[PDB]
Amino acid sequence: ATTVPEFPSKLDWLNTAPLQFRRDLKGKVVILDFWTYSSINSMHVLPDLEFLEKKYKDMPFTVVGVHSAKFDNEKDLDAIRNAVLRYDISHPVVNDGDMYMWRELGINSWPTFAVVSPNGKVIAQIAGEGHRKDLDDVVAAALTYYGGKNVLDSTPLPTRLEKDNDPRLATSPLKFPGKLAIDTLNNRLFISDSNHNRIIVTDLEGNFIVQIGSSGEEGFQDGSFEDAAFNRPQGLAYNAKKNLLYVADTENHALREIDFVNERVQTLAGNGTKGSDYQGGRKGTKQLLNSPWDVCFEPVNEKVYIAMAGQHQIWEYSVLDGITRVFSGNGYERNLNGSTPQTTSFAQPSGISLGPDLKEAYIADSESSSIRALDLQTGGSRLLAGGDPYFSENLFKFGDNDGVGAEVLLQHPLGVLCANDGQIYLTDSYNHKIKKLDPVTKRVVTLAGTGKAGFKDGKVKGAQLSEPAGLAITENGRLFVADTNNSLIRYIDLNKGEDSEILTLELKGVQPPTP
Ligand SMILES: [Cl-]
Ligand SMILES: [Cl-]
Ligand code: NA
Ligand code: NA
Ligand code: NA
Ligand code: NA
Ligand code: NA
């Protein structure tokens, strides 16, 4: 039986004083969760771990999220810490950024659970999602067994939650805003205040108008604007014709309709449960979704296109008949461009935007680190920038680099926008940059930020962003950014070109959710 290795010293910890197997975990049943915060499957099992953490609240048991990074941005401890906050992780987390623990145990995928005994022997090793009951069973067995031997110690752990270390988390008006939308005719900005579980509506200068989902708790409720609840929502799309806001309500696996004419919120598809349905076609909320991350609206045929980050697909909600179908993507996580939906594949797509023609849709394909164009007529896709165009299986061709074709390198882009002039704006998220893509030339240029996570409101080329993920634009040319880990809405007036500077949009009247 494998004896788990000790954690190396000068491995940083979050949510806790540094732990080790010989001093603090001796006498505990431990689940090692090998994860990385860019993995939607890693995200998919956090609620499994929350289940076990609550079930075994006052038993000698602990989850340790061994964060083994995929992307290079993910080795920075402050990146993981923002993820730990965004994801509501409260168990111990250690940044094993060079995968020492990963390799020593033989971990192959994300996520992968290693269950360790009070003595330090590895008694089970499970990979993949959908193993809540399997883990529930091992931990039960281990507990009632090693408790029979009387080798368990229920001394507390040196718990120091990161969310209890920051005064401003409660204070800031916005908590990790991710996605944006705009109503230029009536001059309104739509903010996905993700980790406040609400939707904030202001004016293009920054002035509060109305708040949808007022209690700020995580929940899943339809009804009035004060009674509604979301769960860390992400993408938004605005229906000018009917004065509606569509919400990709990611952690409820649902599509919500914010109805401003009637001041109510109603659910269009999904039901709070992560589906595993790859064809779809059912009506309204009979149809399950899976981590809808971005949503955009096509007003001619009245179609809502959903970037289904959970299943690597683009889906299509139809306003006329309330049906949600797969639109493109066969289900495998690949950077596979093909003529037909079934011969096409995405990699955790998280951003979707319609071109001015209304005939293509550009996709932030975060896990292949590429921008792609989905053909609305054929359900097929083409590669614009990034990715490994010779290997669809390759999901590790990332970096930071401007240019054309193979010269381009990105890193987990989350956000994409198509201006009415038909140029493409993206947030290279792990590079903390805004970048511009031209669809014809396929040339990508850095437009803002230095590549270094932080905050600074300077002249764009030396200014700073922290993991930006959302975009919206005016015809005047002001480009709003959702600067996520800075919990700020920036903006760039694009007219000024090489003279231009990124600013912060000060919000007037926007207060955090009552506690
Ligand atoms: Cl989340
Ligand atoms: Cl069926
Ligand atoms: Na959106
Ligand atoms: Na429902
Ligand atoms: Na599959
Ligand atoms: Na298919
Ligand atoms: Na089609």
Swiss-Prot record:
Question: What region holds the Thioredoxin domain?
Answer: 1-144
Localization per record: Plastid, Chloroplast thylakoid membrane
Q: Which residues form the signal peptide?
A: none
Start-end of each NHL repeat: 173-205, 219-255, 281-320, 410-440, 462-495
Q: Which residues lie on this side of the membrane: Lumenal?
A: 1-515
- State the disulfide connectivity: 39-42
Q: Summarize what gene deletion causes.
A: High light intensity-dependent and irreversible nonphotochemical quenching (NPQ) due to a decrease in chlorophyll excited-state lifetime.
Record family assignment:
In the N-terminal section; belongs to the HAD-like hydrolase superfamily.
| Function field | Required to maintain light harvesting efficiency, especially during nonphotochemical quenching (NPQ) recovery, via the regulation of chlorophyll excited-state lifetime probably by preventing the formation of a slowly reversible form of antenna quenching.
Q: What is this protein called?
A: Protein SUPPRESSOR OF QUENCHING 1, chloroplastic
User: What organism is the protein native to?
Assistant: Arabidopsis thaliana (Mouse-ear cress)
What gene is it encoded by?
A: SOQ1
Q: Which residues of the full protein are shown?
A: 393 to 907 of 1055
